[PDB]
Design brief:
Distance between the termini of chain A: 16 Å
Number of strands of chain A: 3
Oligomer: part of a larger assembly
Protein name (chain A): Spike protein S1
Shape of chain A: flat
Number of helices of chain A: 0
Order of helices and strands of chain A: EEE
Largest interface: A-B, 7 and 5 residues
Strand order of the largest sheet of chain A: 1-2-3
């Protein structure tokens, strides 16, 4: 992939961290409708917390009926406030034409 | 160079500046952990508890 499809310049970089690919339950490129990934993004007292749950839900029309608590995944003492957020999607190329 | 004199060797500097940011404590250096005994009335400490 290319990292510049998201940004153009990086300035004053103080924190970087590499860990396991916490998008578990990954399958083939068209394995959708078989699993559901839930995430909670929070920022309390400077701890930015990410909770996750990769439950292989046989989805119906929408989020199903039932309970599944999100086990904690990471806590980071970054201390920065969060106001605006965005979601990152991915796109395949043509691979045949320039 | 390797054979420098002590007065001007590449002297190490390790500043362990204790920094108080806007987040509770999450880093420690506990190079003191002792042994553990069981089935006896003792006093115990586990990372703060």
């Amino acid at each position: 992939e290319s990292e510049f499809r998201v940004y153009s310049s990086a300035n004053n970089c103080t924190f970087e961290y590499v860990s396991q690919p916490f998008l578990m339950d990954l399958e083939g490129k068209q394995g959708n409708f078989k699993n559901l990934r839930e995430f909670v993004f929070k920022n309390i007292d400077g701890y930015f917390k990410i909770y996750s749950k990769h439950t292989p839900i046989n989805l119906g029309r929408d989020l199903p009926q039932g309970f599944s608590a999100l086990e904690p995944l990471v806590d980071l003492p970054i201390g920065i406030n969060i106001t605006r957020f965005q979601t990152l999607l991915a796109l395949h190329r043509s691979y045949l034409t320039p | 160079r390797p054979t420098y004199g002590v007065g001007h060797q590449p002297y190490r500097v390790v500043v362990l500046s204790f920094e108080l940011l806007h987040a509770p404590a999450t880093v420690c250096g506990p190079k003191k952990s002792t042994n553990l005994v069981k089935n006896k009335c003792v006093n115990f400490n586990f990372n703060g508890l």
